mmCIF file of C-alpha atoms in Angstrom:
data_model
loop_
_atom_site.group_PDB
_atom_site.id
_atom_site.type_symbol
_atom_site.label_atom_id
_atom_site.label_comp_id
_atom_site.label_asym_id
_atom_site.label_seq_id
_atom_site.Cartn_x
_atom_site.Cartn_y
_atom_site.Cartn_z
ATOM 1 C CA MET A 1 0.000 0.000 0.000
ATOM 2 C CA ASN A 2 1.455 3.378 -1.110
ATOM 3 C CA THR A 3 -1.049 5.981 -2.317
ATOM 4 C CA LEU A 4 -1.180 9.682 -1.752
ATOM 5 C CA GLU A 5 -4.271 11.696 -2.749
ATOM 6 C CA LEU A 6 -3.761 15.420 -2.803
ATOM 7 C CA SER A 7 -5.425 18.647 -3.943
ATOM 8 C CA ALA A 8 -2.983 21.319 -4.983
ATOM 9 C CA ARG A 9 -2.136 24.323 -7.104
ATOM 10 C CA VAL A 10 0.560 24.116 -9.820
ATOM 11 C CA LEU A 11 3.488 26.207 -8.630
ATOM 12 C CA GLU A 12 5.877 25.180 -11.411
ATOM 13 C CA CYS A 13 5.495 23.121 -14.539
ATOM 14 C CA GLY A 14 8.594 21.872 -16.236
ATOM 15 C CA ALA A 15 9.454 21.623 -19.909
ATOM 16 C CA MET A 16 8.257 18.347 -21.603
ATOM 17 C CA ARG A 17 11.086 15.780 -21.855
ATOM 18 C CA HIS A 18 11.284 12.207 -23.090
ATOM 19 C CA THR A 19 12.971 9.082 -21.850
ATOM 20 C CA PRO A 20 15.265 7.180 -24.273
ATOM 21 C CA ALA A 21 12.276 4.955 -25.252
ATOM 22 C CA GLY A 22 10.481 8.162 -26.243
ATOM 23 C CA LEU A 23 8.105 8.258 -23.221
ATOM 24 C CA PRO A 24 6.917 11.816 -22.260
ATOM 25 C CA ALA A 25 8.134 12.854 -18.834
ATOM 26 C CA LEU A 26 7.242 16.042 -16.985
ATOM 27 C CA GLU A 27 8.206 17.347 -13.567
ATOM 28 C CA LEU A 28 5.834 19.687 -11.631
ATOM 29 C CA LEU A 29 5.941 21.558 -8.319
ATOM 30 C CA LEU A 30 2.657 21.337 -6.403
ATOM 31 C CA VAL A 31 1.619 23.483 -3.399
ATOM 32 C CA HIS A 32 -1.147 22.189 -1.123
ATOM 33 C CA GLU A 33 -2.961 24.264 1.513
ATOM 34 C CA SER A 34 -5.640 23.219 3.993
ATOM 35 C CA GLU A 35 -6.744 23.004 7.583
ATOM 36 C CA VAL A 36 -6.728 19.670 9.387
ATOM 37 C CA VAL A 37 -7.612 18.521 12.902
ATOM 38 C CA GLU A 38 -4.803 16.678 14.812
ATOM 39 C CA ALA A 39 -5.411 14.928 18.174
ATOM 40 C CA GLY A 40 -8.524 17.122 18.415
ATOM 41 C CA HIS A 41 -6.922 20.493 17.462
ATOM 42 C CA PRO A 42 -7.016 22.719 14.305
ATOM 43 C CA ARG A 43 -3.823 22.969 12.213
ATOM 44 C CA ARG A 44 -2.787 24.802 9.067
ATOM 45 C CA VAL A 45 -0.986 22.584 6.558
ATOM 46 C CA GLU A 46 0.969 24.048 3.619
ATOM 47 C CA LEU A 47 2.932 21.394 1.642
ATOM 48 C CA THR A 48 5.077 21.941 -1.480
ATOM 49 C CA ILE A 49 5.966 18.710 -3.224
ATOM 50 C CA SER A 50 7.656 17.764 -6.449
ATOM 51 C CA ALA A 51 5.657 15.482 -8.710
ATOM 52 C CA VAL A 52 6.586 13.469 -11.759
ATOM 53 C CA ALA A 53 4.241 12.454 -14.577
ATOM 54 C CA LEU A 54 5.317 9.889 -17.175
ATOM 55 C CA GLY A 55 3.361 8.917 -20.286
ATOM 56 C CA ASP A 56 -0.247 10.047 -20.723
ATOM 57 C CA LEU A 57 -0.398 12.270 -17.589
ATOM 58 C CA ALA A 58 2.734 14.067 -18.781
ATOM 59 C CA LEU A 59 0.936 14.877 -22.081
ATOM 60 C CA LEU A 60 -2.180 15.883 -20.151
ATOM 61 C CA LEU A 61 -0.294 18.111 -17.692
ATOM 62 C CA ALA A 62 2.244 19.590 -20.145
ATOM 63 C CA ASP A 63 2.191 23.411 -20.072
ATOM 64 C CA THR A 64 -0.413 23.642 -17.259
ATOM 65 C CA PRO A 65 -0.917 27.329 -16.423
ATOM 66 C CA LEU A 66 0.776 28.205 -13.098
ATOM 67 C CA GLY A 67 -1.740 28.606 -10.295
ATOM 68 C CA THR A 68 -4.059 25.955 -11.815
ATOM 69 C CA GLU A 69 -5.903 23.853 -9.244
ATOM 70 C CA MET A 70 -5.426 20.065 -9.525
ATOM 71 C CA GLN A 71 -6.510 16.828 -7.844
ATOM 72 C CA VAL A 72 -3.910 14.109 -8.075
ATOM 73 C CA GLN A 73 -3.115 10.688 -6.709
ATOM 74 C CA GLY A 74 -0.075 8.501 -7.016
ATOM 75 C CA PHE A 75 2.675 6.849 -5.015
ATOM 76 C CA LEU A 76 5.584 8.283 -3.047
ATOM 77 C CA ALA A 77 9.186 7.368 -3.899
ATOM 78 C CA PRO A 78 12.570 8.596 -2.702
ATOM 79 C CA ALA A 79 13.783 11.527 -4.745
ATOM 80 C CA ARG A 80 17.145 9.859 -5.213
ATOM 81 C CA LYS A 81 18.495 6.455 -4.225
ATOM 82 C CA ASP A 82 18.528 6.207 -0.437
ATOM 83 C CA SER A 83 17.146 9.730 -0.208
ATOM 84 C CA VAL A 84 15.019 10.894 2.686
ATOM 85 C CA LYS A 85 13.471 13.474 0.251
ATOM 86 C CA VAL A 86 10.269 12.311 -1.410
ATOM 87 C CA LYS A 87 8.574 12.831 -4.755
ATOM 88 C CA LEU A 88 5.035 12.048 -5.811
ATOM 89 C CA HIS A 89 4.809 9.722 -8.898
ATOM 90 C CA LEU A 90 1.511 10.603 -10.571
ATOM 91 C CA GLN A 91 -0.956 7.880 -11.502
ATOM 92 C CA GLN A 92 -4.085 10.093 -11.768
ATOM 93 C CA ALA A 93 -4.597 13.798 -12.214
ATOM 94 C CA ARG A 94 -7.408 16.073 -13.207
ATOM 95 C CA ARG A 95 -7.301 19.819 -13.838
ATOM 96 C CA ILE A 96 -10.064 21.603 -11.918
ATOM 97 C CA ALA A 97 -11.560 24.705 -13.571
ATOM 98 C CA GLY A 98 -12.728 27.469 -11.251
ATOM 99 C CA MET B 1 -7.472 16.743 0.380
ATOM 100 C CA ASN B 2 -4.183 15.398 1.817
ATOM 101 C CA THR B 3 -4.206 11.674 2.627
ATOM 102 C CA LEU B 4 -1.481 9.054 2.405
ATOM 103 C CA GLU B 5 -2.171 5.315 2.928
ATOM 104 C CA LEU B 6 0.924 3.224 3.452
ATOM 105 C CA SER B 7 2.055 -0.260 4.464
ATOM 106 C CA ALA B 8 5.503 -0.240 6.085
ATOM 107 C CA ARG B 9 7.879 -1.833 8.573
ATOM 108 C CA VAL B 10 8.888 0.061 11.742
ATOM 109 C CA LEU B 11 12.575 0.882 11.319
ATOM 110 C CA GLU B 12 12.771 3.179 14.365
ATOM 111 C CA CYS B 13 10.410 3.861 17.238
ATOM 112 C CA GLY B 14 11.289 6.807 19.479
ATOM 113 C CA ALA B 15 10.592 7.245 23.184
ATOM 114 C CA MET B 16 7.155 8.637 23.871
ATOM 115 C CA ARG B 17 7.130 12.249 25.053
ATOM 116 C CA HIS B 18 4.470 14.919 25.781
ATOM 117 C CA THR B 19 3.802 18.263 24.035
ATOM 118 C CA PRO B 20 3.452 21.441 26.182
ATOM 119 C CA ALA B 21 -0.254 20.591 26.400
ATOM 120 C CA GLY B 22 0.412 17.198 28.059
ATOM 121 C CA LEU B 23 -0.545 15.353 24.882
ATOM 122 C CA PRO B 24 1.330 12.022 24.309
ATOM 123 C CA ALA B 25 3.655 12.328 21.244
ATOM 124 C CA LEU B 26 5.741 9.714 19.406
ATOM 125 C CA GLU B 27 8.151 9.843 16.400
ATOM 126 C CA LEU B 28 8.733 6.691 14.271
ATOM 127 C CA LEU B 29 10.722 5.900 11.083
ATOM 128 C CA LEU B 30 8.852 3.735 8.542
ATOM 129 C CA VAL B 31 10.199 1.891 5.509
ATOM 130 C CA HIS B 32 8.064 0.696 2.598
ATOM 131 C CA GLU B 33 9.397 -1.757 0.022
ATOM 132 C CA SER B 34 8.622 -1.606 -3.699
ATOM 133 C CA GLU B 35 10.078 -3.158 -6.872
ATOM 134 C CA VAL B 36 11.699 -1.248 -9.757
ATOM 135 C CA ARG B 37 16.315 -2.030 -8.235
ATOM 136 C CA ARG B 38 15.357 -2.241 -4.567
ATOM 137 C CA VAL B 39 13.170 0.840 -4.082
ATOM 138 C CA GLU B 40 13.194 1.660 -0.373
ATOM 139 C CA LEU B 41 10.808 4.485 0.643
ATOM 140 C CA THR B 42 11.590 5.832 4.110
ATOM 141 C CA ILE B 43 9.150 8.148 5.824
ATOM 142 C CA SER B 44 9.249 9.816 9.187
ATOM 143 C CA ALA B 45 5.880 9.590 10.921
ATOM 144 C CA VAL B 46 4.434 11.423 13.939
ATOM 145 C CA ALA B 47 1.696 10.012 16.229
ATOM 146 C CA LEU B 48 -0.339 12.071 18.728
ATOM 147 C CA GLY B 49 -2.676 11.243 21.633
ATOM 148 C CA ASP B 50 -4.179 7.761 21.522
ATOM 149 C CA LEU B 51 -2.173 6.671 18.445
ATOM 150 C CA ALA B 52 1.103 7.435 20.223
ATOM 151 C CA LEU B 53 0.059 5.056 23.087
ATOM 152 C CA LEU B 54 -0.770 2.356 20.544
ATOM 153 C CA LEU B 55 2.519 2.618 18.706
ATOM 154 C CA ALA B 56 4.703 3.302 21.686
ATOM 155 C CA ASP B 57 7.405 0.624 22.161
ATOM 156 C CA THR B 58 6.525 -1.081 18.885
ATOM 157 C CA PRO B 59 9.229 -3.709 18.165
ATOM 158 C CA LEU B 60 11.401 -2.777 15.160
ATOM 159 C CA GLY B 61 10.586 -4.822 12.089
ATOM 160 C CA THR B 62 6.850 -4.830 12.893
ATOM 161 C CA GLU B 63 4.512 -4.564 9.856
ATOM 162 C CA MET B 64 2.019 -1.669 9.978
ATOM 163 C CA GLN B 65 -0.839 -0.162 7.954
ATOM 164 C CA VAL B 66 -0.990 3.589 8.447
ATOM 165 C CA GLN B 67 -2.934 6.567 7.180
ATOM 166 C CA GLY B 68 -2.677 10.329 7.680
ATOM 167 C CA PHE B 69 -1.684 13.666 6.154
ATOM 168 C CA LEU B 70 1.745 14.923 4.968
ATOM 169 C CA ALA B 71 3.256 18.194 6.167
ATOM 170 C CA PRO B 72 6.731 19.752 6.044
ATOM 171 C CA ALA B 73 9.072 18.728 8.857
ATOM 172 C CA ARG B 74 9.328 22.463 9.638
ATOM 173 C CA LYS B 75 9.206 25.987 8.175
ATOM 174 C CA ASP B 76 10.489 25.814 4.589
ATOM 175 C CA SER B 77 11.991 22.350 5.169
ATOM 176 C CA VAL B 78 12.564 20.134 2.131
ATOM 177 C CA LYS B 79 11.695 17.158 4.371
ATOM 178 C CA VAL B 80 8.178 15.778 5.063
ATOM 179 C CA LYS B 81 6.496 14.008 7.956
ATOM 180 C CA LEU B 82 3.464 11.746 7.908
ATOM 181 C CA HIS B 83 1.029 12.928 10.656
ATOM 182 C CA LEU B 84 -0.734 9.689 11.572
ATOM 183 C CA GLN B 85 -4.524 9.631 11.857
ATOM 184 C CA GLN B 86 -4.888 5.851 11.753
ATOM 185 C CA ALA B 87 -2.535 2.944 12.306
ATOM 186 C CA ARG B 88 -2.933 -0.749 12.839
ATOM 187 C CA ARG B 89 -0.580 -3.711 13.323
ATOM 188 C CA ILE B 90 -0.108 -6.988 11.358
#
């Protein structure tokens, strides 16, 4: 089990790249903001996380306007081998239109 | 919406403490295993109140199913922490 669901705004949207096998790959920077209750107390949560799309989601998310609201889900992986930093690997994403 | 569901093994289980409000608090280190190399996801988790009592003194190596929200370890930190809202053994 490894699945993160998150609502966020696109803070940065990289240039479209491709793997050697020609697969589209895109890196984005997402910023999440919300209030949550912890142990029975209110708490502001502001999370910035790097996310990677590969394949069809990369094509879908390519050139997303900055500030765009999104709803994504995917799995967490270390940024780099043995890294304590984490990156979200997108499996689902949808661009919300205000 | 900010919810992470994760199966993991307890790599580190800290000593239980208490916040300035007398609330029980515990810090653990969890490791999740995935395939393609040997992908090893490590995640620092924090348990409060009742969950801290449940997880306190958990033997290392123990398999857990956890759920909660992610937040930065601190102001502008590049590191994250999983704030546990649910957790269960085996």
